[PDB]
Design a protein around this ligand. Structure first.
Ligand SMILES: [Zn+2]
Ligand SMILES: [Zn+2]
Length: 259
């Protein structure tokens, strides 16, 4: 059977590592954190069963493979309460894709929009403080708004999976996870709260596993009086995709400070 922790690249074929999906295989429950971009060819066939898929948030790059995953596995999706309708109705999906396209531009087509709504009985709303016994490991959800009103983080023992609430990290460079539009005050509060949890390792949705110290570097980055300007040493299409995303995030950061 499946055991241990699996960190799987779930980005588009042009940049598989831009997004990471985590799977924690406990003795009693198997849980997945996030679900990749719609256009990802990530293969999760190494799983015999899947009990829960926790969505850190509802941005399109974290919920892409749900349609297929919910047909192959008997998994239930856990989402912040009040947002289930965005996944279970045509009008809900239309709004998710609408906001995604407006914010992402060309990246919308790279990652891929949502095309199929999910069955309501497969989606469970949670408050963001629920605890689960995975069997040999303990999981606890944590509501972490700021990046989005529907953002939640996940703590498995001393591993903290932060989604897009505590930064991104590529090639040794800290990138702000601040696309339009973030709630600056809430974002800062959630970031401080997570730093205070003192996890041993952090799992970024964008950048994979990183040291907890990176969260503190991101906090400092958020407090800079000078305009944040980032440059990442990466080439090819992957480099261009990342640069576009960075521009979106820097725009969001600039605008959040004016609020
Ligand atoms: Zn996001
Ligand atoms: Zn994201």
């Amino acid at each position: 059977p499946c055991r241990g922790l699996h960190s799987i690249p779930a980005g588009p074929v042009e940049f598989p590592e831009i997004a990471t999906v985590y799977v924690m295989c406990g003795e009693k429950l198997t849980v997945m954190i996030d679900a990749g971009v719609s256009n990802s060819i990530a293969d999760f066939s190494f799983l015999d069963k899947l009990d829960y898929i926790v969505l850190t948030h509802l941005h399109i790059d974290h919920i892409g493979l749900l349609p297929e995953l919910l047909q192959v596995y008997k998994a239930k999706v856990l989402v912040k309460s009040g947002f289930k309708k965005y996944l279970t109705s045509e009008d809900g999906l239309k709004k998710l894709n609408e906001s995604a396209e407006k914010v992402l531009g060309d990246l919308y087509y790279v990652y891929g929009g949502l095309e199929k709504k999910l069955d309501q009985d497969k989606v469970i709303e949670v408050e963001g403080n629920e605890e689960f016994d995975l069997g040999g490991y303990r999981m606890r959800l944590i509501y972490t708004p700021g990046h989005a009103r529907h953002h939640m983080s996940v703590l498995v023992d001393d591993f903290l999976f932060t989604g897009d609430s505590a930064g991104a990290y590529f090639n040794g460079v800290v990138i702000p996870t601040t696309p339009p539009v973030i709630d600056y005050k809430m974002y800062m509060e959630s970031l401080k709260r997570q730093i205070e949890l003192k996890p041993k390792v952090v799992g970024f949705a964008h950048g994979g596993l990183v040291s907890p110290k990176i969260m503190e570097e991101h906090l400092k980055q958020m407090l800079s009086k000078e305009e944040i300007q980032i440059n990442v040493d990466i080439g090819g299409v992957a480099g261009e995709i990342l640069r576009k995303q960075i521009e979106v995030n820097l725009r969001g950061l600039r605008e959040s400070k004016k609020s």
